[PDB]
Each structure stands twice: as C-alpha cells, then as structure tokens.
Write a protein that holds these residues in place. Structure first.
Motif, PDB file in Angstrom:
ATOM      1  N   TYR A  29       0.826  -1.204   0.000  1.00 54.00           N
ATOM      2  CA  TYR A  29       0.000   0.000   0.000  1.00 54.00           C
ATOM      3  C   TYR A  29       0.867   1.264   0.000  1.00 54.00           C
ATOM      4  O   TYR A  29       0.518   2.265  -0.628  1.00 54.00           O
ATOM      5  N   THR A  30       2.000   1.204   0.687  1.00 59.58           N
ATOM      6  CA  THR A  30       2.895   2.351   0.786  1.00 59.58           C
ATOM      7  C   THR A  30       3.889   2.394  -0.372  1.00 59.58           C
ATOM      8  O   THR A  30       4.018   3.409  -1.059  1.00 59.58           O
ATOM      9  N   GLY A  31       4.571   1.281  -0.594  1.00 58.94           N
ATOM     10  CA  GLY A  31       5.644   1.239  -1.565  1.00 58.94           C
ATOM     11  C   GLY A  31       6.955   0.857  -0.911  1.00 58.94           C
ATOM     12  O   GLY A  31       8.036   1.147  -1.425  1.00 58.94           O
ATOM     13  N   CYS A  32       6.853   0.210   0.241  1.00 58.02           N
ATOM     14  CA  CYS A  32       8.019  -0.218   0.995  1.00 58.02           C
ATOM     15  C   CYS A  32       8.357  -1.659   0.654  1.00 58.02           C
ATOM     16  O   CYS A  32       7.466  -2.494   0.514  1.00 58.02           O
ATOM     17  N   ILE A  33       9.638  -1.951   0.510  1.00 62.92           N
ATOM     18  CA  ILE A  33      10.066  -3.296   0.165  1.00 62.92           C
ATOM     19  C   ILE A  33      10.574  -4.030   1.398  1.00 62.92           C
ATOM     20  O   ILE A  33      11.231  -3.434   2.254  1.00 62.92           O
ATOM     21  N   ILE A  34      10.244  -5.310   1.496  1.00 61.34           N
ATOM     22  CA  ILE A  34      10.712  -6.134   2.598  1.00 61.34           C
ATOM     23  C   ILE A  34      11.704  -7.168   2.083  1.00 61.34           C
ATOM     24  O   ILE A  34      11.321  -8.179   1.494  1.00 61.34           O
ATOM     25  N   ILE A  35      12.978  -6.885   2.283  1.00 60.27           N
ATOM     26  CA  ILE A  35      14.047  -7.750   1.804  1.00 60.27           C
ATOM     27  C   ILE A  35      14.743  -8.455   2.969  1.00 60.27           C
ATOM     28  O   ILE A  35      14.769  -7.940   4.089  1.00 60.27           O
ATOM     29  N   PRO A  36      15.304  -9.649   2.717  1.00 58.69           N
ATOM     30  CA  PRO A  36      15.995 -10.440   3.743  1.00 58.69           C
ATOM     31  C   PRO A  36      17.247  -9.742   4.281  1.00 58.69           C
ATOM     32  O   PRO A  36      17.641  -9.952   5.430  1.00 58.69           O
TER      33      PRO A  36
END
Length: 46
Positions: A29-36
C-alpha cells in the motif's frame, strides 16, 4: 529489510500496521520493500 522511498511512507507503514495490519499489505500500500538483507543504501534507506 523493510525500506521505504521516503520516511513519509515508513510512517504510513507504521500507522497502517498500528491495529496489527499485515506487513505485506501495508508495504504494498505504501511502496516499501521487505528484503531479507538489512543493508539498505542511503539512496533507499527510509
């Protein structure tokens, strides 16, 4: 890890997950990425 374009999006992410909303939901919804990886360059570390 979870890294946003601007801090505005991160705070948006925080407010979104305030009632316990799924991270993937709010991240998309925001545009934030969740990376390891925890390493985010200052270019995209917000």
């Amino acid at each position: 890890t979870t890294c946003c374009p601007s801090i505005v999006a991160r705070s948006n992410f925080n407010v979104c997950r305030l009632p316990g909303t799924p991270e993937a939901l709010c991240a998309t919804y925001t545009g934030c990425i969740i990376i390891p990886g925890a390493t985010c360059p200052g270019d995209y570390a917000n």
